[PDB]
Design a protein around this ligand. Structure first.
Ligand SMILES: *[C@@H]1O[C@H](CO)[C@@H](O)[C@H](O)[C@H]1NC(C)=O
Ligand SMILES: *[C@@H]1O[C@H](CO)[C@@H](O)[C@H](O)[C@H]1NC(C)=O
Ligand SMILES: *[C@@H]1O[C@H](CO)[C@@H](O)[C@H](O)[C@H]1NC(C)=O
Ligand SMILES: *[C@@H]1O[C@H](CO)[C@@H](O)[C@H](O)[C@H]1NC(C)=O
Ligand SMILES: *[C@@H]1O[C@H](CO)[C@@H](O)[C@H](O)[C@H]1NC(C)=O
Ligand SMILES: *[C@@H]1O[C@H](CO)[C@@H](O)[C@H](O)[C@H]1NC(C)=O
Ligand SMILES: *[C@@H]1O[C@H](CO)[C@@H](O)[C@H](O)[C@H]1NC(C)=O
Ligand SMILES: *[C@@H]1O[C@H](CO)[C@@H](O)[C@H](O)[C@H]1NC(C)=O
Ligand SMILES: *[C@@H]1O[C@H](CO)[C@@H](O)[C@H](O)[C@H]1NC(C)=O
Ligand SMILES: [Cl-]
Ligand SMILES: [Cl-]
Ligand SMILES: [Cl-]
Ligand code: NA
Ligand code: NA
Ligand code: NA
Ligand code: NA
Lengths: 344, 222, 209
């Protein structure tokens, strides 16, 4: 027997203590080595309630990533409400590694194993583990990258699907590659992301089919973001230490969801590498040096989408726009099937 | 439960635009969104939009057709609601609202701005004509007043005897005339015996047109 | 796609009496319903969040409850300060609202008629005003007769809020005519129908006397 509880978790990883890459450096002093022989125990005839939207594991991962970024990223200038801080800004080595979250003595992590678990409610196939799977702390907007996939069908997660102020997380059951490139020696800031259009459109069509299930059978329409900082109106992410902003207008394209010529084939998103950014920690503006020379390339798996639904009474259609900005939702997309309980 | 501070009343021609501002914090850590609503004369509250001050994310009621834009200043202390291509039925009191910080629902509006009247009309600024409503020569208590006619925009303030006479005074809500101009009446009941001895003056003040009137209201002589 | 059906749209009660307004959701909404109070001329005030939770700094007499599809807001003993409009909120959807005011002994209106000023006649227009003073309940009917001919379409009226002390309403009705049309008739009268009036009262005047 056990009871729901919060406690201080610790992280474990396979970080290399000799690496200079910044995630490895953080995890080397902040986490312990991974457990060589992890044990999972399935609990028979146990039914338990999970709630991904109120799960303190998320706040704890958030604290860790914030502190990882605070000590790893080296902007030439930070501007915070009035104070200007100038410093050296050498280029860094940057590539996320998986982090595991682990309970101390007296506590265990319960894990939901129902294939189509949506994040809240009863789980019938429960097991207990000492540590989560390895989660890459990938910071991105609009598209969730390098995450885990849903086991069976595409899943829609929300605290309240009818609350337009609540983010919606779409969990894909098949990854779509996005291949981003700032080519070697035009403008050095200009880059592009390539996506298999044939594959992306099929997946988006399946997402609409699933979204329809939650709103009667209304027409489902995608539109570009209505406004906001570039970090959220564009697909934003860091590759090799550079800050990429990619225009996703072509990705959320409704005609391609019949056979109009040119839906299939490669989709090329225009991107920019920005030196001046708003910090996702939320501490103001930062400025970095121009990009490193040569080919800058990031091939990632799209494993989820963040959506916001338009408000206002509408009986005909529902409109969804790519969203994000609250980086905690990124962690929720991976921690949704875990909860900490205290052993009695 | 502090009040938020909105900008002042605005008047606009159809087709123009207006920007309402809403100060919601001092310039001295999860943040609830700033919401904007409006309420038309004798109508139910209508939700327009929310705006996340951390990154400027927004959500607009679909039927506003992109005529509405919400932003915030760099310090994230003030939100702005811009409404373009105004029509007369945009005429309303506009509010900003916000959930209390410790609450976990975006929609329980604990904090409200004082409201910003927005009037959309093709009418031009005009001060009122002020006519007497004479005490009838038909004698306990008699009634008299001032008709404040044909002004735009609202509001007008009305005193009696330079604000000295407050008891028995009823100043009625203005009414919009088909001409596009407003009118209101202010009345006072007083002892009839007083009519012969007491001077009654209604002081009307129409700031927008910089118009002031002290109308003496007397019994009409035959 | 949800619909909030509030009721009643209006109600009266005596000081200290009990009042209950209810909301009906077309679908199950759990406890995601807030209640608001709005006084004339002022911004709304949150009273109850998440259906049951009484907001801080709100009198104990205010109470909300319900779940799923049925909700209500209740005021233990109605006070004078509680005269306002009340409505429920489900995200961006609002109930139709419920006006509540103090109930009192029926009071007949004190009726007056005012002819147009000589000043305004020069302006080309003639306004005739009919005052109904200090009555209850608010429901009254004002009828303009020009030479014993019922008028409709050329009249507007305005009503005060319920006076805090006597709990009565006052109403003002204005008949607007051109100067030329006004000088084409003799008798100008307003007929008032109210519950406190055994028989409809008519005040009037003859133009030029
Ligand atoms: C329960 O979940 C596990 C995955 O952890 C799976 O291997 C097993 O077959 C499932 N079956 C049940 C209902 O126990
Ligand atoms: C997830 O499942 C629970 C229980 O079946 C349900 O109450 C909740 O609304 C679901 N969430 C969504 C939006 O699918
Ligand atoms: C993913 O989910 C959809 C249903 O939402 C299903 O039709 C599709 O076959 C699934 N894909 C795979 C490869 O399992
Ligand atoms: C990514 O795109 C670049 C430029 O087109 C290409 O050279 C490279 O082969 C691509 N990588 C993969 C794995 O497709
Ligand atoms: C694009 O994706 C589809 C799968 O949906 C695949 O059949 C096709 O070969 C892909 N194009 C490539 C790999 O160039
Ligand atoms: C993305 O590209 C489209 C097409 O050019 C453009 O209209 C839109 O403004 C761009 N989005 C942003 C945020 O710049
Ligand atoms: C969406 O697809 C259609 C059909 O190929 C195309 O005509 C249109 O330009 C696309 N829209 C965008 C902005 O990518
Ligand atoms: C995703 O993972 C791949 C494979 O390790 C990596 O090369 C890529 O840079 C990652 N993308 C991001 C945005 O971290
Ligand atoms: C929001 O979610 C709760 C459970 O957390 C649920 O009971 C309620 O029905 C939802 N509210 C709605 C649909 O308005
Ligand atoms: Cl830049
Ligand atoms: Cl929040
Ligand atoms: Cl929020
Ligand atoms: Na770099
Ligand atoms: Na876009
Ligand atoms: Na920001
Ligand atoms: Na919208």
């Amino acid at each position: 027997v056990w009871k729901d509880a919060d406690t201080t978790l610790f992280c474990a990883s396979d970080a290399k203590a000799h690496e200079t890459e910044v995630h490895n450096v953080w995890a080397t002093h902040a986490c312990v080595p991974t457990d060589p022989n992890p044990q999972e125990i399935h609990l028979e005839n146990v039914t338990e309630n999970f709630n991904m939207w109120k799960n303190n594991m998320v706040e704890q991962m958030q604290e860790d990533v914030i502190s990882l970024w605070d000590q790893s990223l080296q902007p030439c200038v930070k501007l915070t409400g009035g104070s200007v801080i100038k410093q050296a800004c050498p280029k860094i080595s940057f590539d996320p590694i998986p982090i595991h979250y682990c309970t101390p003595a007296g506590y265990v992590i319960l894990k939901c194993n129902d294939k189509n678990f949506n994040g809240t409610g009863p789980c019938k196939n429960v097991s207990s583990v000492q540590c989560t799977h390895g989660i890459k702390p990938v910071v991105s907007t609009q598209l969730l990258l390098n995450g885990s996939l849903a086991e069976e069908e595409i899943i829609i997660r929300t605290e309240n699907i009818t609350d337009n102020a609540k983010t919606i997380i779409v969990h894909l059951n098949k990854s779509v590659e996005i291949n981003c490139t700032r080519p070697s020696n035009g403008d050095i800031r200009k880059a592009y992301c390539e996506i298999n259009g044939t594959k992306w459109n099929k997946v988006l069509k399946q997402v609409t089919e699933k979204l329809k299930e939650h709103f009667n059978n209304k027409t489902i329409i995608f539109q570009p973001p209505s406004g906001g900082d570039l970090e959220i109106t564009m697909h934003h992410f860091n590759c090799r230490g550079e800050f990429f902003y990619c225009n996703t207008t072509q990705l959320f394209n409704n005609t391609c969801i019949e056979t109009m010529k040119g839906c299939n084939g490669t989709i090329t998103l225009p991107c920019k590498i920005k030196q001046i950014i708003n910090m996702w920690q939320g501490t103001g503006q930062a400025m970095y040096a121009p990009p490193i020379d040569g080919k800058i390339n990031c091939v990632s798996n799209i494993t989820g989408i963040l959506l916001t639904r338009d408000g206002g009474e509408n009986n005909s259609t529902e409109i969804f726009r790519p969203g994000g900005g609250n980086i905690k939702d990124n962690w929720r997309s991976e921690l949704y099937k875990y909860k900490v309980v205290q052993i009695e | 439960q502090v009040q938020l501070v909105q900008s002042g009343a605005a008047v606009r021609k159809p087709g123009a635009s207006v920007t309402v501002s809403c100060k919601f914090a001092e310039d001295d850590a999860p943040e609830h969104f700033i919401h904007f609503l409006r309420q038309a004369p004798g109508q139910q509250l209508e939700w327009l939009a929310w705006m996340n001050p951390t990154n400027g994310a927004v959500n607009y009621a679909w039927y506003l057709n992109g005529r509405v834009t919400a932003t915030r200043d760099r310090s994230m202390t003030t939100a702005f609601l811009e409404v373009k291509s105004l029509r007369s039925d945009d005429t309303a009191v506009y509010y900003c609202a916000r959930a209390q910080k410790r609450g976990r629902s975006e929609w329980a509006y604990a904090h409200w701005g004082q409201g910003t009247p927005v009037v959309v009309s093709s009418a031009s600024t005009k001060g009122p004509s002020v006519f007497p409503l004479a005490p009838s020569s038909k004698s306990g208590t008699a009634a008299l007043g001032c008709l404040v006619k044909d002004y735009f925009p609202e509001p007008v303030t009305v005193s009696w005897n330079s604000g000295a006479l407050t008891s028995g005074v009823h100043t009625f809500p203005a009414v919009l005339q088909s001409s596009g101009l407003y009118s209101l009446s202010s009345v006072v009941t007083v002892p009839s015996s007083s009519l012969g001895t007491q001077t009654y003056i209604c002081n009307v003040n129409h700031k927008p047109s910089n118009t002031k009137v002290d109308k003496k209201v007397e019994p009409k002589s035959c | 796609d949800i619909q909030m059906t509030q009721s009643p749209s209006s109600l009266s009660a005596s000081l200290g009496d009990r009042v209950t307004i209810t909301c009906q959701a077309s679908r199950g909404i759990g406890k995601d319903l807030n209640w608001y109070q709005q006084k004339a001329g002022k911004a709304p005030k949150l009273l109850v969040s998440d259906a049951s939770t009484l907001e801080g700094g709100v009198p104990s007499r205010f109470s909300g409850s319900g779940f799923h599809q049925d909700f209500s807001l209740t005021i233990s003993s109605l006070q004078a300060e509680d005269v306002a409009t009340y409505f429920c909120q489900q995200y961006e959807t609002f109930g139709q609202g419920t006006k509540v005011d103090i109930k009192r002994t029926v009071a007949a209106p004190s009726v007056f008629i005012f002819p147009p000023s000589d000043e305004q006649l020069k302006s080309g227009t003639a306004s005739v005003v009919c005052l109904l003073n200090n009555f209850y309940p608010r429901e009254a009917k004002v009828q303009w007769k020009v030479d014993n001919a019922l008028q409709s379409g050329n009249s507007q009226e305005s009503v005060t809020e319920q006076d805090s002390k006597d709990s009565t309403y006052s109403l003002s009705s204005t008949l607007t005519l051109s100067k030329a049309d006004y000088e084409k008739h003799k008798v100008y009268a307003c007929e008032v129908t109210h519950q406190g009036l055994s028989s409809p009262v008519t005040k009037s005047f003859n133009r030029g006397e």
